[PDB]
């Protein structure tokens, strides 16, 4: 409506194709493989949105935490509605074990994200762990992520970066996330029917 593409999916509190949009990604960082998705992103004659993992699934981590000046909603810091930025709990970030089997006979649109920081003392602030990662897999694809850390500019007022990724989780299949830190999990997902 007022938004771009991606952020509108991620949910981007600033919006509820578009040529060159005001709001794409409210927090900085890359977007991995925008182009590819765009193509078969259209050719969809049917659409609705539903949840998969609520924030209430995690007792071992601090759920509603990340919201920033870079992503406010009416002057109040917020975050991409559907993505969820996870912070350490009780000075502790237990490695995440979570999996979602798609029981729906209809396919599923899946995305998640990785937060890049600058100082590792600052890494120690949020995630408590000096060296973290993300590793996900579905059937064909197996992903492994690590945050790149030195220092940076101020883009969107922010010194940090956030890369997000995408996949398509086949029906009666699963997807396996693994991270001890620097990870941004999903909350709500998209049921998709192709053309």
């Amino acid at each position, epitope marked *: 409506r007022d938004c771009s593409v991606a952020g509108w999916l991620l949910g981007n509190p600033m919006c509820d194709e578009k040529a060159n949009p005001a709001n794409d990604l409210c927090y900085p960082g890359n977007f991995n493989d925008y182009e590819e998705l765009k193509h078969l992103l259209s050719r969809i004659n049917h659409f609705e949105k539903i949840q998969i993992i609520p924030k209430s699934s995690w007792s071992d981590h*601090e759920a*509603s*935490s*990340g*919201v*920033s*000046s*870079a992503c*406010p909603y009416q002057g*109040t*810091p917020s975050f991409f509605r559907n993505v969820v930025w996870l*912070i*350490k*709990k*009780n*000075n502790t970030y237990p490695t995440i074990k979570r999996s979602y089997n798609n029981t729906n006979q209809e396919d599923l649109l899946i995305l998640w994200g990785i937060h890049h*920081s600058n100082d590792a003392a*600052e890494q120690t*602030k*949020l995630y408590q762990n000096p060296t973290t990662y993300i590793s996900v897999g579905t059937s064909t694809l197996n992903q492994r992520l690590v945050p790149k850390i030195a220092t940076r500019s*101020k883009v969107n*007022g*922010q*010194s*940090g970066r956030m890369d997000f990724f995408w996949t398509i989780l086949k029906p009666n299949d699963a997807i396996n996330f693994e991270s001890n830190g620097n990870f941004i999990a999903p909350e709500y997902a998209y049921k998709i029917v192709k053309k």
Partner: antibody
Amino acid sequence: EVQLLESGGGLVQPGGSLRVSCTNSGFTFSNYAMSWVRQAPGKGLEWVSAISGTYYADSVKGRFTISRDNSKNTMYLQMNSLRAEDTAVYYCVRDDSYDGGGHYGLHNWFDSWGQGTLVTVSS
Amino acid sequence: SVLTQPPSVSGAPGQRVTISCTGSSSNIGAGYDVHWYQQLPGTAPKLLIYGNSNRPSGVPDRFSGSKSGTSASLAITGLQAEDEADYYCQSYDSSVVVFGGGTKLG
């Protein structure tokens, strides 16, 4: 050390005026939001105001003014109209946020606290 | 500036004491975090807890915040004579900032 320093406070009369600077070293002023928190005698803490963009608590509104100079790396609080109940020790404070390079007060905390400078309203 | 806190606790060394900070559904029924401050008697406040469960450095592991609904709790295990102070909780409501009323302490 990381030093927050508030200077120049003392006796002011009711309906007086006071300008209190907070003096800063050890980090990059412009990279953080700052606040003032005051504590009355035998009382707890009450948010006064903050600046990255200026915010103020209700009790002070219109008679307090928060101002920051990163050129000189200090920040003021202008208090006019001062009554009685305004007497408190004044802590200059650091706003520290999960979300980092934010200049934002919305939800962040106070990690670094000033030494405090007591303002007194009476004769 | 007031959330709610008990006036004072009392405890014994090594024992465990629990500090409640209550509130309405407006502020802690919102999801904004709770932060705590340990302020030595005649000294500035020191940031104690932040983000409800986390501590900065120079702070012991004997300190744990737990946030529940419209309330929140500060607990201390393995007590020491160095731990005596006024404990306030901070949170936001419709901006501003709100504080506890503090809690004091064989």
